[PDB]
Amino acid sequence: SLVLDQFGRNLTAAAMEGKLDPVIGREKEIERVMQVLSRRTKNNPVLIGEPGVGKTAVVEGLAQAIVHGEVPETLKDKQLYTLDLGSLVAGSRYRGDFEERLKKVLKEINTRGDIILFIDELHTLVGAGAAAIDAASILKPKLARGELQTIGATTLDEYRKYIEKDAALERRFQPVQVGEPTVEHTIEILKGLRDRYEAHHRVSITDAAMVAAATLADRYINDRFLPDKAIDLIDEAGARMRIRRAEVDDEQIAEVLGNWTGIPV
Amino acid sequence: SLVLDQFGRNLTAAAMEGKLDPVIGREKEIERVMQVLSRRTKNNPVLIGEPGVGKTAVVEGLAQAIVHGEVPETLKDKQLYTLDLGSLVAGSRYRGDFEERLKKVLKEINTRGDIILFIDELHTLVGAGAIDAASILKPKLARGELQTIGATTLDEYRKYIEKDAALERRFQPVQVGEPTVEHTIEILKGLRDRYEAHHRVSITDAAMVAAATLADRYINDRFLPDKAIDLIDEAGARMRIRRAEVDDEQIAEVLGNWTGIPVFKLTEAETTRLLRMEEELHKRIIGQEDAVKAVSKAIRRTRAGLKDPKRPSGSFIFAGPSGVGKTELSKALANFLFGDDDALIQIDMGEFHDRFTASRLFGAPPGYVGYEEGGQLTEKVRRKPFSVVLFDEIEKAHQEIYNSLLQVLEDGRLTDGQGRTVDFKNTVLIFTSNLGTSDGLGFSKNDYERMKQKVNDELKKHFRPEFLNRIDDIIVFHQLTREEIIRMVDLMISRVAGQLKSKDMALVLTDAAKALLAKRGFDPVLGARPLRRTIQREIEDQLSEKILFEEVGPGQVVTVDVDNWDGPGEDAVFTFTGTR
Amino acid sequence: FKLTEAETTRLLRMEEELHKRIIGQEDAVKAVSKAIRRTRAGLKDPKRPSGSFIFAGPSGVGKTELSKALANFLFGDDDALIQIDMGEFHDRFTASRLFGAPPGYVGYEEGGQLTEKVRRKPFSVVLFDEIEKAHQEIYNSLLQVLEDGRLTDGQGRTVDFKNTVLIFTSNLGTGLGFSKYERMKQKVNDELKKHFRPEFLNRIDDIIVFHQLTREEIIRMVDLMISRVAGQLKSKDMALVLTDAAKALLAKRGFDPVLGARPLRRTIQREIEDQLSEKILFEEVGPGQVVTVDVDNWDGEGPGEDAVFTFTGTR
Numbered sequence A: 001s002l003v004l005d006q007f008g009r010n011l012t013a014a015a016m017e018g019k020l021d022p023v024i025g026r027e028k029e030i031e032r033v034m035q036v037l038s039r040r041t042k043n044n045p046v047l048i049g050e051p052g053v054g055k056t057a058v059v060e061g062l063a064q065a066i067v068h069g070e071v072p073e074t075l076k077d078k079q080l081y082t083l084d085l086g087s088l089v090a091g092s093r094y095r096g097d098f099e100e101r102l103k104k105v106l107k108e109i110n111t112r113g114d115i116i117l118f119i120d121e122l123h124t125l126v127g128a129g130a131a132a133i134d135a136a137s138i139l140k141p142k143l144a145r146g147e148l149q150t151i152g153a154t155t156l157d158e159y160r161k162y163i164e165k166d167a168a169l170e171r172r173f174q175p176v177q178v179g180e181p182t183v184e185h186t187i188e189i190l191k192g193l194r195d196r197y198e199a200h201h202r203v204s205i206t207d208a209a210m211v212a213a214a215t216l217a218d219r220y221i222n223d224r225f226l227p228d229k230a231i232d233l234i235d236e237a238g239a240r241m242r243i244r245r246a247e248v249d250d251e252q253i254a255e256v257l258g259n260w261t262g263i264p265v
Numbered sequence B: 001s002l003v004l005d006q007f008g009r010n011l012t013a014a015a016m017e018g019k020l021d022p023v024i025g026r027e028k029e030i031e032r033v034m035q036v037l038s039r040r041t042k043n044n045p046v047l048i049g050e051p052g053v054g055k056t057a058v059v060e061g062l063a064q065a066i067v068h069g070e071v072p073e074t075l076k077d078k079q080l081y082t083l084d085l086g087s088l089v090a091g092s093r094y095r096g097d098f099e100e101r102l103k104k105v106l107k108e109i110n111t112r113g114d115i116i117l118f119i120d121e122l123h124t125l126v127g128a129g130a131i132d133a134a135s136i137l138k139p140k141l142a143r144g145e146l147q148t149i150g151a152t153t154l155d156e157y158r159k160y161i162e163k164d165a166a167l168e169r170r171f172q173p174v175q176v177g178e179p180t181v182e183h184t185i186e187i188l189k190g191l192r193d194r195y196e197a198h199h200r201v202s203i204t205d206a207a208m209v210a211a212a213t214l215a216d217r218y219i220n221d222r223f224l225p226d227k228a229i230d231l232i233d234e235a236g237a238r239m240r241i242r243r244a245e246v247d248d249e250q251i252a253e254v255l256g257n258w259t260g261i262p263v264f265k266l267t268e269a270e271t272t273r274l275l276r277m278e279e280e281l282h283k284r285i286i287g288q289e290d291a292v293k294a295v296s297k298a299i300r301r302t303r304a305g306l307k308d309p310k311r312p313s314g315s316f317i318f319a320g321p322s323g324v325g326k327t328e329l330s331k332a333l334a335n336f337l338f339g340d341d342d343a344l345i346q347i348d349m350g351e352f353h354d355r356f357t358a359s360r361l362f363g364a365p366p367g368y369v370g371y372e373e374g375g376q377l378t379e380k381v382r383r384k385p386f387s388v389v390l391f392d393e394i395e396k397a398h399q400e401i402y403n404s405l406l407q408v409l410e411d412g413r414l415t416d417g418q419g420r421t422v423d424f425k426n427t428v429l430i431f432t433s434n435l436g437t438s439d440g441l442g443f444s445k446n447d448y449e450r451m452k453q454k455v456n457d458e459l460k461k462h463f464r465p466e467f468l469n470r471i472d473d474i475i476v477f478h479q480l481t482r483e484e485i486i487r488m489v490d491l492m493i494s495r496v497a498g499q500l501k502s503k504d505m506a507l508v509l510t511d512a513a514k515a516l517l518a519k520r521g522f523d524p525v526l527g528a529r530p531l532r533r534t535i536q537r538e539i540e541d542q543l544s545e546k547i548l549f550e551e552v553g554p555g556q557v558v559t560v561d562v563d564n565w566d567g568p569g570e571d572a573v574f575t576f577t578g579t580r
Numbered sequence C: 001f002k003l004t005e006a007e008t009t010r011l012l013r014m015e016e017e018l019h020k021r022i023i024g025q026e027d028a029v030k031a032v033s034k035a036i037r038r039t040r041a042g043l044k045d046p047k048r049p050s051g052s053f054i055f056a057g058p059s060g061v062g063k064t065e066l067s068k069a070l071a072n073f074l075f076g077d078d079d080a081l082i083q084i085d086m087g088e089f090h091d092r093f094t095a096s097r098l099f100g101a102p103p104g105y106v107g108y109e110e111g112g113q114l115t116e117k118v119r120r121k122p123f124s125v126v127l128f129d130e131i132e133k134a135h136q137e138i139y140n141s142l143l144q145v146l147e148d149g150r151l152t153d154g155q156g157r158t159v160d161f162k163n164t165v166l167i168f169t170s171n172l173g174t175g176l177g178f179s180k181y182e183r184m185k186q187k188v189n190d191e192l193k194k195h196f197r198p199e200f201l202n203r204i205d206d207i208i209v210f211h212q213l214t215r216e217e218i219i220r221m222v223d224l225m226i227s228r229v230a231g232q233l234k235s236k237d238m239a240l241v242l243t244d245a246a247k248a249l250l251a252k253r254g255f256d257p258v259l260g261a262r263p264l265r266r267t268i269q270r271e272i273e274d275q276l277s278e279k280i281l282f283e284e285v286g287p288g289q290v291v292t293v294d295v296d297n298w299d300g301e302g303p304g305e306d307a308v309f310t311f312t313g314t315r
């Protein structure tokens, strides 16, 4: 476990400790991910979607589900380790260092046998240690045969630019679309997240505040995507209220949006 | 051997242990590999083919055949070793570690004599040690002192191997082609014994036939023998997780989840909704019975399975007067199909006046700025294969831009600047045109028939015959009647009342108010926009004045009435009264 | 190879095989078959492509259908054809995707999307459909292929088209006073000469103008179009049979010489296909029974402005 802990972060342990935010309304996406992970070969889902729609939140919710034990028997008590390529490529100065580290990580995973790798920003896996032999080339034989469960995550544009330019690697990952939630789903997400933000900012957020945040964020802010597009308004209104001082209402959300976009709402 | 085991994986041992999947139908490829391997010199075959077609499976089948003994006397007892370049490179910290390792491996192969190397992903061999492994191996390959198989994709082969002509000359290309549907069905029949055993389910012949056919038809970026197996594996995994049999319905559901194209079976609610599709669309579109019927017929044909597999789901030209609902119908269709108007892929062709803007659709050619960004339309259709595409006011686009969509209309395909072919066979294409609306000089003897003839003549005049020939339907919209305007007053007032109710205010209009609004906002020539302007000037402005003046506030039931009218009220005046 | 007896007899009756999918157009099928047989017999010119044809004539008559049928015959799949869709090559600078970008520029590693395809499969059918709407630079580039059989891509490599069959399908070319097909042929030839350079046309092996479909050809093609629907229904465990009255009426309603066979296609679509879809959804006809289409209120000869199709489902 030592080799893994120095090149990655145990997401299941964090979920057990309660460090991950609740995930609401992603039952279908998590079920689809579990379905792909239970395959016999090529059991490597990749979460694809616009930036900010909840790609990493889906994996965090999967970790929480694994901790709670609601997952099927195949994924029961599996440890979800998020891999950080920066750590792998940090000390690799001489020839063979990066390959040695990656091979050691894979050997440890195989020996333990109860580990699911998670690679957010999977496009960084293409040509990581070299222009050639790199992380992708080393992983390809393991990924193809289904001996190494992995959950990738990328955006649409990054997937098209990098992953699709390497057909051999792109063949080994099953796309799992995650879409921008509707306004009602965003309201449910905000209601679920309310507790953590209230605790952090020591403020009270009303239901009208959540509804206003979701609706206004959908209506006015244009270049962003709803989940974070609305959590931003909620969090910034809470920050304003805490700085001034203890309640957040639709008026505060409207003020935050007006400062953001300049539209006098 | 010890070194070979350290730096490689024994495939013959795995085949003896039964760890390799069966290989079906690749007798010709295995035979040709055997032929090339037995040559006197340059006996180094390389399998080149698209990803997922079974290049590694061919070598696995060759190892299985060698284990069984159905091979010529040359390869009667050869041991097939897959080489791991990563294992060689890893740990080669010093100057001579990698070259020493490679030399030791080659010496061991030469001494034992019965080993056949398999360099999977041969393109990675060009610069493994950077002296790189390619330079070290080159002398051995040419003289036939080292029997080696290679495997690479066509693109990787061209990009990397063909750069070094000397290295390329020493490898014999063996072409592995994408199997046909029947070959894939045979492959699935072969693999079922293991897949169902792993998933603890039962897979029927119908399920495998459906998997092969659907994967071939609907998934276009993959290659058949692998996409079909993915469908089967996902269906089996779903059956294992839910709790067992896997049928064609499961494969259809898996494909529908994968690509988003609704191929799964129709439920009672879904079929009932489809049957009443005209009524559902009429909840938002008033009048225009013919256009709604045409769109509903197209969608029902697509969902019932009678669609033409080649052409798109349906191509329409919505022409006619202005303000009658040409764009609104497409928006309502998108809402019905996907539940949100924003699901519509809308292209405003008014911005395509200049011809050089055609590259905005399929991107820029190679070697030009913006080449890597693809196209605005091709990528959007690729991400959502089943979608409604709306070309708004196509008549304003350059004549050279609507000539680029002929293959889209007929063959249902569009090639972007990068060479990717994007299929349109599942989309619904709607071109909205206003031709023949600006508008008899001499003595003249329905009006709708004359309008239809004028619009059709204008369409023929503008578009070339080969464009109008490919279009499923050309629908000319009627002008709105007084009854339709009266009905649409309710829609517009509901639009306003939603905003008011967001403020905790309920808006009620007496029938007299609705009649007066219909009377004032009815102009047959200008369509339904004058009614919108009238409602805006008579209601929205007055309501805003009232709200900002605090005359009516939250919790009040605003009621609108007409006072100085009886039943042409130029003197009629609206009165807004609020009560708790 | 050594032409086997089966392969030799298949080649001998190539016209019959092609006509199973193509109705009419005897001259074009004969020309294509003659080119293929000449190539296979070993008498082809060693320094020119295996054949170069310009299909022209009326719309919706089978200019691209013949190319697809030829590709299907030669290789057993319509997808073996290399289709370029020249409609999107209007811009001058867009030729770089036929031959690739020059070295040192973005996207040069990928080569061209035509030269690479031909290089991978030297023996293949290439279809430059709607050639008239490409820029003149593309014609100048393809002049080299026509004259010498080799083409130079961006990287500088030469790819040989000597074993390739090139087909250019064009819609180019589509009476004052008292007067009492050859006219169409002459008009098409005049338009072709006006548009293309004389030497470009001189290098083309054949220029074929397709005949407009006649009533008998439409009658024959009704069965061919209905075969697709029958096969599609077969997957649902339902068989479709049209009585001779139904076929006669479909031919009568869908026959219009100027617009070709597409009107018949949309007539089949809106007359039986959509009604069958509605009935299947409503479950009036289901798996395990045969659907017989018939016609009533029709005298059998007069136009059926009142005749209506009727579907009967019998176990």
Ligand SMILES: Nc1ncnc2c1ncn2[C@@H]1O[C@H](COP(=O)(O)OP(=O)(O)OP(=O)(O)O)[C@@H](O)[C@H]1O
Pocket (backbone or CB within 6 Å): A021, A022, A023, A024, A025, A026, A050, A051, A052, A053, A054, A055, A056, A057, A058, A154, A155, A189, A192, A193, A227, A228, A231
């Ligand atoms: N279903 C959800 N439930 C609860 N919170 C969510 C949900 N979806 C998104 N969030 C919130 O959205 C915010 C951002 O989402 P996320 O962490 O997934 O970014 P992302 O998808 O990785 O975008 P990118 O990949 O471009 O960086 C998170 O704070 C997360 O708490």
Ligand SMILES: Nc1ncnc2c1ncn2[C@@H]1O[C@H](COP(=O)(O)OP(=O)(O)OP(=O)(O)O)[C@@H](O)[C@H]1O
Pocket (backbone or CB within 6 Å): A041, A144, A167, A168, A169, A171, B021, B022, B023, B024, B025, B026, B050, B051, B052, B053, B054, B055, B056, B057, B058, B151, B153, B187, B190, B191, B225, B226, B229
């Ligand atoms: N003839 C075949 N018989 C049985 N299974 C096959 C056959 N061909 C392909 N498969 C299946 O195709 C799947 C994909 O693996 P494949 O052998 O194609 O690797 P590959 O061709 O090297 O792909 P890549 O280009 O990414 O390296 C195999 O798991 C195998 O089950």
Ligand SMILES: Nc1ncnc2c1ncn2[C@@H]1O[C@H](COP(=O)(O)OP(=O)(O)OP(=O)(O)O)[C@@H](O)[C@H]1O
Pocket (backbone or CB within 6 Å): B284, B285, B286, B287, B288, B321, B322, B323, B324, B325, B326, B327, B328, B329, B433, B434, B488, B528, B529
């Ligand atoms: N048949 C209709 N049914 C319901 N609403 C309609 C109808 N026609 C017009 N409207 C109203 O008119 C407004 C815009 O109409 P629309 O854009 O569809 O006209 P149009 O067909 O695009 O005319 P043009 O494009 O030539 O200007 C919509 O808000 C819509 O509410």
Ligand SMILES: Nc1ncnc2c1ncn2[C@@H]1O[C@H](COP(=O)(O)OP(=O)(O)OP(=O)(O)O)[C@@H](O)[C@H]1O
Pocket (backbone or CB within 6 Å): B466, C021, C022, C023, C024, C025, C058, C059, C060, C061, C062, C063, C064, C065, C066, C171, C221, C260, C261, C262
């Ligand atoms: N001679 C024909 N024989 C069989 N089917 C035909 C024939 N002509 C047309 N069809 C039918 O018409 C459909 C399309 O015809 P096709 O595209 O080949 O004509 P075209 O020459 O390309 O006209 P244009 O390119 O000018 O639009 C075919 O799918 C086919 O079903």
